[PDB]
Amino acid sequence: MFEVPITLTNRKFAQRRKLKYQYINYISRRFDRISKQQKKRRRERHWRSVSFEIWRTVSSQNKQPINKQKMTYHNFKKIEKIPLRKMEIPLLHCTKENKLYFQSISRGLEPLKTSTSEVRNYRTRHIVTLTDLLHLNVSRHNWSLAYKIFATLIRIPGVQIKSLWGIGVEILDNLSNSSSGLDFLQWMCQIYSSKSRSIVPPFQTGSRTHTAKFAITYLWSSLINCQKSMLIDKISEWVLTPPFMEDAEVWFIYASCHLLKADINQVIKHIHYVRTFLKICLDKGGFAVPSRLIENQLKSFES
């Protein structure tokens, strides 16, 4: 009854995706008319958005001024009447269950059974139980067992997992053995920052534009591994190393490394340094203290 860390068993789900987005195309096409191939599926699924430290959202202002009813019964069934027969053509090619699914989603009914609930393989089900016991043990502070789970798992050939935040916080709270959360993260960036879809929201990502969660969390959490101190020029040495320019958060990490190193003219250069990176961190989507507060610490320094 929980998400599975495997690529979903295939055929029928994909041909259903076909029927769905194809009919979607015909209805929305005729809709814009009335307002006036893997690749066809690709363009189709394509043109669509794919007191505490709250990474705040974008609130409501500078947005439209309503709409008034577009869709009566007669007018909708006008738009619907034709694309449903076009659908009658390839429905004849798909399977009877698939056809039924097309009929029901197109009535607007939502299917009883999940993709998992109708899925149907030994090795993958075993990996499912393995990974599950990993996540469970890591939740249970059972770092020993959890470590055994992790080693036995990574042994397997079967699936790569984005599951990466699972292992970041996993090895993090594990402390037990294996080349740790930082090693995993910098591995993620080294393998997936070069040319060398379904599964992917933001908490696991590709290094064209922002890989977010794991990177910023090893960044901050490493600066807290300096809270262990009072390592920094290391953390910002390998935050210096990568080019993935849409961050700024590593600009505030950088300027935080300079404020932490500023705690004689050397200390001056560190304070001018943080003064610089706070503005080249006004470069991008802002991380802001009132920042006259940042400067006020910097004047407590100017003492």
């Binding site: 075993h126 393995l130 055994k148």
Partner: peptide
Amino acid sequence: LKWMEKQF
């Protein structure tokens, strides 16, 4: 998990 690492 034992039977997983043995028989998978």
